[model samples]
Target: VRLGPKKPPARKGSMADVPANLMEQIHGLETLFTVSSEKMRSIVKHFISELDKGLSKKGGNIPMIPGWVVEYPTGKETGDFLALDLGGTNLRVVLVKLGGNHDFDTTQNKYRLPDHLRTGTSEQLWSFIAKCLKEFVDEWYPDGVSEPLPLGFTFSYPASQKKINSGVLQRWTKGFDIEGVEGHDVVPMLQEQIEKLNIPINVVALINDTTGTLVASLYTDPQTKMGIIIGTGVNGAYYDVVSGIEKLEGLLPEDIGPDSPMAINCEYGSFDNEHLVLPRTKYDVIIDEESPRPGQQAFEKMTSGYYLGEIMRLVLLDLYDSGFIFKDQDISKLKEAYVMDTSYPSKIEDDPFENLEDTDDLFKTNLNIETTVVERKLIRKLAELVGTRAARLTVCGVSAICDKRGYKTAHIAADGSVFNRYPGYKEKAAQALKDIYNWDVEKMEDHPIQLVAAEDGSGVGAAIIACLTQKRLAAGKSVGIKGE
Candidate 1:
């Protein structure tokens, strides 16, 4: 007997109906989307080269930015802190209570972040967050607390930082364009709003989502040295020696300790922008052409949740236009950009029945189109083609880090819907890793490097960071900047 949801039955006879023309199209897509194990190893080599380049004084395509997060949780950390994650469509405000023994409890509330505030003035953005915090506090603590609570804020954007509690907004992504926020210290702005509304919270640590994932992952399992996110976006953070942070040779505190582990947020989404080693296909080219920020975020466009569905859509539409499939349908609705979300392909790929029940429902319900058995087979193959490539490509970065760090064994905690929810996603990645390393192993679970589910980094990780900062202060040391 197995745990969780009943295991999906073995996929059998699902491809018995592929016609000749559809078979040709499937072959074409596989050619375009497949990355061989040899290619993955080559890419890993290039990834390491780029990673080293990014860490150098003169950076390369990838931005290996140093996260000011200098410490890991000792598991003896205990605290009650507030954590806010402002990355996605909603703003999540969480109260995280950390107890010793790597345990924590959380209560949280989510406030819908409308476009009105997202593209609104900076004041509106901060004010809304502050308002949300008040609402959360009111709901959780009807009676006021004795003192102000520490907050670990996960500001999921590009930022330059000099300390733990502060950072300069570098740029915005995920459609957020608040005015007067760019090139400014975000923590201070939030503080202003919090004070104006008399919110009883103190911003102690300014966290990035990937960095928080790293910290949070470590808090849960000491073996987890790397934290990654690969859903709508892709990024990672890991512990590194301070000596290798060439950009901060003289900026780091003189007494920040010798050979101390400094967490580095590898903004590797933009990796291979110069088209060095990443194998790109024509479907990927179409996306870059239409993207607002063309020639940027090169790796993310190919691997992330936001673009995977779109990639599948582009391929299907291209085939339809070529009279390969869907000959007589208007397909205008299908032409709509992003009509096929990541979930669409996920569902199609995970369809268990030989009759393709889920695949049929996905197309008719969401796409408003009908599909013949052969067509469903082709589409199912396409889903695997795209998703498998993404999974294979993603692990190249992971492999590079492992090789660079000389980690024969480590636990990589990953937090993202693409990696966690999408069926068979981890297995694809695991197989890719085996191919890259040419491993002769049976179970990936016992493999030298493993990917595991991660904690809510923005919430629990942030609170843990706050606890670490408290310890830093108590030890008469600075949080991120130069120490006394």
Candidate 2:
């Protein structure tokens, strides 16, 4: 069996005391979550094949978007650029001042995105974004700056892009279901709103957060080859030479050569929507059926932070309903969806006592139920299985991308709440990579593919992309989009 993520040190005690029936069930669930070395290799192969198909065709499920960022920053490119990051919950406006050296300063303000706007009309959403941008400009330019600043917009969703400054919304993800926006160009809509508000800003680049992360990481470390997010959602982007993108055969500019590389937004969360590659559990099916975009983002449903806690809840509820555990107890709170957060399971698995005193408190306080030592142990075990499976499965995707690029060693700049905050996640992923490649301990160290903690890519990265775009425009290169 694989040495998964760190088990609760408290679980060092023997499980001989656990009920035989419960032990059987635990063993079964572990088997379901555990992907053997052979299975992982198969999954990696399937992932790479699908990646190629997506880049070669238009109707492929994985929209391998071309980011139009053909080059990386050289650290000496200096400028003042504006950035607006609109995510699931919050909107941030940033001003980045690059000083020609490797140094830079960033000032930003965050605003909450109202729940109604998420489902509201397009005008409402864009107008609200425009209002926020207006407020940011008013505060910074109290004396009225003369020039219109170039701005980069980080829109973290599935957008079909023909160029850097243009993208049509493919579908709403991350809990957003706004109307009148799908299949429409987002850049002009946002520009119209900014113009209406009289904000002296010019929209230069439109990028996904994952692409922004990659560009921003490359700005500091040229070795950085990939950007990954493992938070509320999961997605990735990497550098791919334009020649490899067959889908753009007659679409790109005739002047541009094939040697240039562009960032490909591998909306990797939707990797296996056909259920062809991933190993899905019953809980995963339930998640998909209940999601807003059912049958979409199939891979994301299994691995993302937004759904991990819910998957755990469904499993425990099944056990409770089956009369196997939590006997004679009211689990009304547990019946509610999303009452238990992903962090709760991580905490249970991190508890450090044989009796799971911390786990006991979590159950009593959070779920209003008391658990026996056996039940607590089972919960911890289940959490570990879920977390471990997620971590290991994540490696298959990253490794697939690297293998496709023939990268024996590369830097993965990973960002987001779960990847940064979750304990032992990096180790589990690294272990999975070692198993996949059959690397010895010494070989792993000499030429390891490491996950580096990335900076705020949506903020600083947008600025960097805007600066690069400006350089292309100044050199008389046809960058496909110009500021208003």
Candidate 3:
């Protein structure tokens, strides 16, 4: 007997017309597929360009995201700088001193981002963050002694960034459901918060996580073509021509302008949500139905580390709900569905014991779900298959980007705990790229598309942008760098 979901019987003769909505969804998926395919092609070209244009030979090939934003030393990058990173669970504040020959020194502190702020009033959230920043500044820089710190507000949420210091909130993507924050330019809101707190720091850049990652990776090494955050969520950032963007209506500021006209944040996470080419199992469909934004971020569903654990959880829930494995037991472990984390899979996958000892321990002790050695072996294999599928599919999107950009070989700077800690992830993701790109095994040995751990793209990228801004401001420009 087959263990999978039963397929519907096919109609032999001519059938009634399919629903228009279904057809529309199907069409939408098709369009997404086309767009993704195109983007992949562009990614390939960008990769190739980076490979050919890069200065360094290797060391995982960092993306050198550019120093225009941070405005480090360069003698020209003289000024006080402050940065704030609101990366879900924590808020990180940095006091940067940019001046002297090379122009950079930093002191940092961390604060817990309370859950109340995330779900509560808009004022509460921003005010809390502003308060933290204010306190940090007061403690470190003091009132009178502190220089005019050019602040780079690193808000990682999805916002439509117009300039280095401006962006509009594009609705909360990472499961945040803030009511008043949506459909508003985040800079003003943040500015109001800072002003209310009476923080002396002058707010400047408004950046996305991906953009920050891109900037950070690029600063370290220019070859880093792309940056992706595979942590609690997944999103991408790459340099795109300002002219190429359809949304922008021509007149952009003069300072943050690019000669070739490139905007930093590409936001590839929301790509291919309808899932034309993506093989969506029933589980994926269920996931879409259950997500905060249904039928969105289909590509993310396949890849992101956030959903990886969720994916495994649902699979386990299915097994338990079906009354198969733990048929009559308390099923407390099964009940604690959210507790099933990526760590479980990591532990099982890394099991060193014979006869799947590690895998057995995962169920018997860690999860409190009992499974025999043989059952553990079978389940472990199943979990591995699921994990492998996720890793491979991720490659397709990355490969699509490379293919779109016409890159035969280049390195990708992947940041976050998922990509960093997951056992065999690099190997699997690499192999997936090789498989999808169809690289010649022998000839491509010298030029593998390396996916390596990336640097602090957000922090460092902010520094670089700050440095660039200082240059422009000194040059008597209103804006630091200008893009279309």
Candidate 4:
């Protein structure tokens, strides 16, 4: 461990004595990552086209799956309900008590699902979920209530549903590898566990996280019209009049009226799979080619929180290969796939020290790579390049829905770790929207769209949907409930 004198810290925006050729390469990257207004508009145009096709019976790359959530949550609906959120990182159990008039209280516990359960057998996985539920109930409800508490399961994967309580798993995403669960209804699978454990809970609704966001938003703001998730994976939900969904022409219950609003789960992550509009880089092509479903989730691979850090890592590797940066240090750690987490870039940007000391620590401690001041500065730039592109790309999907729905201004409810945690994410999206819509910030009298962070999509939102389901059932309306 005999080391020489330490190098000076990097000055502000300083890349001291960077080689000419390497600087040229960095400049090229800047151009490649920059998103223009024209590009955003083109992507939005194509996004709308894909959405229309997805709504048709003969679908396109984007599976605009209907969530079967008809009508917004009536604020008058009040009850005690349970919510289970099986999402990207953990499983959450929530107890929500509604007090009506846009008021609610909740208690929740998060159970982390490690890689073993994420990739394990379907039976073992569901049993673990059942066990967690039983434990939570035993701890919270020891007094023993008489009525069967209605439950909502917020399953974030892609599924095809005949009813809210009956969904056939269509495919898996976000690196979940559970098998034997696909092509099967998830309702009875969880219900079996509930019965076996002899718990007084009824699985009433299978909620998509995005649909949950929509209903949750509608619970508070009457003007809220859409909900989107730009976190681990990408998807959105918005209300579509019954007649607008041509694919659902003959499917819905007869009791539902034509003007009734149904939440459309736009699984638009798979948008442009045919490669029509997105500005894909070489790194993007490689990531998709090497993914679990090699040719799917085209949009998500670029924009989702799960893949952003991985993209940053790949870019750094490419730079190293070309001899542009990180010369000859133990970059083996950096070479590992997804070694950089989604939070890494955000952390670097938020580095407090003026000399960028924290950024250096990020590389050295996290990646086991030593970095000079010049390299540290370059890393910061690369982080912005990756994050900016991801944030900008989200505007296309939101704008397309606005164009289709003719909404000039509305509050869009958005949730997820990336959107909520990542700094400047919301502003980047707003900047892109302002440019694409050609609205000057000063005098654009028309109200622009905004993203209001959701209070609780998986918890409060789940509880609301389950409550709505129960209320409708009592009135003899199916509300898309199957097999009690």
Index of the highest-TM-score prediction: 1
Summing lDDT over every window of 10 consecutive residues in candidate 2, give the lowest-scoring window: 1-10
Write candidate 3's Cα lDDT for 115-166 as tens digits. Answer: 7767888878888888898888788865445445677777766565535667
Better of 2 and 4 by lDDT: 2
Q: Which segments of candidate 3 are over 4 A away from where they belong?
A: 1-80, 87-90, 97-105, 113-131, 138-147, 169-200, 252-261, 313-339, 366-368, 440-447, 473-484
Per-residue lDDT of candidate 4, residues 121-218 (tens digit): 88888888889889988888998678888999998777778787777888888778888988999889999988889888999889888888888788
Considering TM-score, which of the candidate structures 2 and 4 is the better prediction for this target? 2
* Candidate 3 structure, TM-score to reference: 0.71
Better of 1 and 3 by TM-score: 1
lDDT of 4 at 182: 85
Q: What is the TM-score (0 to 1) of candidate 1?
A: 0.89
Residue 422 lDDT, candidate 2, scale 0-100: 72
Measured against the true structure, the TM-scores of the candidates, in listed sequence, are: 0.89, 0.87, 0.71, 0.84
Cα lDDT of model 1 by residue, 229-281, tens digit:
98988998888887776766766676566487788889899989998778788
lDDT of 2 by residue, 212-291 (tens): 89988878776788999998888889988878888777666744557777788888778889998799988888888887
Candidate 1 deviant stretches above 4 angstroms? 1-5, 14-22, 87-90, 112-148, 171-180, 192-201, 328-332, 364-369, 481-484
Which of the two candidates, 1 or 3, achieves a greater lDDT against the reference?
A: 1
| Model 1 weakest lDDT span, ten residues long | 475-484
TM-score of 2: 0.87
Question: By summed lDDT, which 10 consecutive residues of candidate 4 come out lowest?
Answer: 1-10
**Residue-level error in angstroms, candidate 2, position 36:** 1.8
